């Protein structure tokens, strides 16, 4: 019974960590974009449209 | 002792809408400012509830299936309804659960009683007439507690039989509405669990007669049926259920 | 706190080490993200005490000295409008530090244009 | 740190090496009061016992039974359980208990046993081969015996067929020892089945009367109302303890709470469905459960090429519960806090960084 | 038997969802690049090489 | 359509809810992607005849 519980909880933890990694990749892309905007719009004037 | 009642007037049973009543606390767990979703035997929102009348001449004490559960509501004045009879065959063949409330206290017994075809009590204008049973042979469980009890008192009761436990939920609501069920929300707090562990498939309500022949006291009660479904219960900061949602009523509530 | 459960969990090897390592990687990546976005200047710039910018009014975006948090009114509004073995690690940069970065960036762009982003 | 990293050289940085846990100090078991006791005083020590051929059947249910009190009494010279353990009677739960009380001879005491065949076993009281419960027997030579001879007790000596298990037969039909027909009239080979016991004070051991109480346990699907006693210990608050409230167990810090439970509620849960408040069954006061302050243990160290001095960060742990410096990241041990400000060398969190100059924070 | 089938099919579905999330992240990166190209090449003239 | 299997699956928690939520997020993200790529003007311009 404890082995069944361990498999279930380990699967839940792995699912959480995997979706956290995917969300972290998305947030890292967003933060790289934010750093680029900080550099090019705040520290300079950008000719890039929109 | 049994007495036939041959002065009734024929009348088909009525129906009315349950409105927003029948919600009870699923368990003994406190929750504060949390919306909880649970799956338990509940009385559905806006469903027809069978309506019985008792007015001078009407006297409605039939035998109805228990099914998976019963919601009992009673617009009660002058304390006409006194108890409930629980069992399957309502004779000496099987065992029955008796819930009564006489002038002193409530008695909860599990015995094999002999039930009359017409069980009722009697009020003399003082209570001096008990004709509901004729024998009591084999008892297995007896329990005594404190009594639970224009329309001025509204009583709601929910009865369940799960895993041999008998759960009684109740809530005393003061209203002033004349005929039908009022509109509002009131969660039914659990009162007492009876570890009876017996088979129950039928039930019967117990009334009281008036002597001045017999006169029917003015009363009206309702009997609903519990259906297993999912509810979304709202708990306020004080921990009581203030509003609920039936997840299978209409798409907005879903 | 179950000893038997931990003994059984020892059969699965280093799964917990992998999960903790991945979460630690995410946690340090968040601080790195904040550093790349906000720590773009090594100089903490300040606006002059007199706010004579040729009629241009930056009060809504410059820090409010009256507030304890030293946040701009727009920043204050932004912070007001956003509301079992589990631990939450605090970020490396506090909100005051990030606000001080934003204040330095604002002072640099107001008083020196784009020149501070390419040199002195 | 070296053992966690599986390396004998450690680079400069901060490394999580273990997990801090506040180990519980006591174990707290709280249970409701022992009320509505079983009426064992009216069974074992009543006014008069019944005869064996008409043994009374006492039903014990809907109450708590303290079998240790009955067990530790020294007057009981026989305490034999054939389906259960005597020391486990206070822990097990059963639906109902059947109590049979009667008076028999001293040498017929051992006939109340499975697999034992005798006069009392065949015609007075029958036990099954898979009997469960305890048989309690003690001598009663000071109460049943009389100088004139106590003949009030009768026992069945003959029957055409043996008794079925737990069957009562109060019939006084004439036994036919021979083949001569008898219509209820006694003859030379037709006698009354009940014979009066010869209990006398002059009778020695073996002929002395014994009062035997036989306990039977049922294990049907009905609720097990009969349960043993519960030993609720004293409550300890404001400490990391292992609590046990009405069978719900766990580890946490029990503290006073301002939450007002509705009177029918016992436990409390949060939005994530974890028990965070419990009502004490002995004294009806609401106790707040805070988890014992665990945290991650991180070691702050420069490169081993530079130094072997380290600092320890207990993440999210107050410094009173573990060069002691309290940060918002946790309790920092081994780093001296300075009022200066430098660029971040090793990140701690919440604006604090550590560097080697000793290790400073 | 149903428990065996349930754990197998749940593992299969979890694997599929993880691949779909990773592919969706890649396609979102491609779509962000395409939106940037629409802004900076269709709605304007770009000095950025290639 | 097996009700026994669904009752057994209920014991595994909110895995199905998580997978459905992830797939719904991907589905709305696709529309967001197309929206961002193509709906960059609110005016429908037309060439002269
Ligand atoms: C009250 O009336 C009911 C039925 O109206 C009586 O029940 C019947 O009694 C007769 C009497 O011989 C029986 O033959 C029937 O079999 C009974 N019917 C059922 C369905 O059981 C009842 O006996 C009456 N009460 C009294 C006290 O006479
Ligand atoms: C710049 O803008 C701020 C706010 O937009 C001005 O502050 C206002 O000043 C007037 C009178 O001077 C007050 O009645 C308002 O209540 C002020 N508003 C706030 C939000 O403080 C400020 O005067 C403007 N000019 C300068 C030079 O700072
Ligand atoms: C309830 O039953 C009555 C008659 O049995 C019927 O007229 C009524 O429509 C029912 N209620 C609903 C909501 O269908
Ligand atoms: C109410 O019923 C109980 C149950 O037998 C009985 O003992 C009691 O006397 C009754 N009350 C009155 C007033 O007769
Ligand atoms: C129930 O009662 C009947 C008659 O009163 C009796 O014959 C029977 O033995 C009883 N059953 C039990 C289990 O006591
Ligand atoms: C309970 O009684 C009903 C009929 O009265 C029967 O169909 C059902 O099988 C019984 N249940 C049990 C558990 O005996
Ligand atoms: C909660 O209860 C307190 C007193 O017990 C009362 O003052 C308050 O109004 C209640 N709040 C709600 C939301 O019921
Ligand atoms: C008689 O037996 C009862 C059984 O509960 C016990 O409580 C009581 O102490 C006994 N009497 C004496 C004098 O020991
Ligand atoms: C149980 O015993 C305690 C001990 O003082 C007492 O305070 C309490 O009132 C008793 N009853 C209940 C129902 O807790």
Author numbering:
A (entry chain B), E (entry chain C): 992 to 1041
B (entry chain B): 14 to 69, 77 to 145, 153 to 176, 185 to 247, 257 to 298
C (entry chain B): 745 to 827, 856 to 892
D (entry chain A): 299 to 620, 641 to 675, 691 to 694
F (entry chain C): 745 to 793
Paper text:
SARS-CoV-2 utilizes a trimeric spike glycoprotein for attachment to the host cell receptor angiotensin-converting enzyme 2 (ACE2) and for the subsequent cell entry step which involves the fusion of host cell and viral membranes. Given its crucial role in the viral replicative cycle, the spike protein represents an important therapeutic target and is a critical antigen in host immune responses. All emerging variants contain defining mutations within their spike proteins, with multiple mutations clustering within the receptor-binding domain (RBD) impacting both ACE2 binding and antibody neutralization escape, while mutations within the highly antigenic loops in the N-terminal domain (NTD) across these variants reduce antibody neutralization. Given the rapidly changing mutational and antigenic landscape of the SARS-CoV-2 spike protein, a structural understanding of spike protein mutational effects and the discovery of broadly neutralizing epitopes is of importance.
To this aim, ectodomains bearing variant spike mutations were used for cryo-EM structural studies. Global 3D reconstructions were obtained at resolutions ranging from (2.25–2.5 Å), yielding open trimers with one RBD in the up conformation and 2 RBDs in the down conformation for all spikes. The resolution within the NTD and RBD was insufficient for accurate visualization of mutational impacts within these domains, due to high degrees of conformational heterogeneity. In contrast, we were able to confidently model sidechains close to, and within the S2 domain, owing to its limited flexibility. The W152C substitution within the Epsilon NTD is inside the footprints of 4A8 and 4–8, and both antibodies escaped by this variant spike.
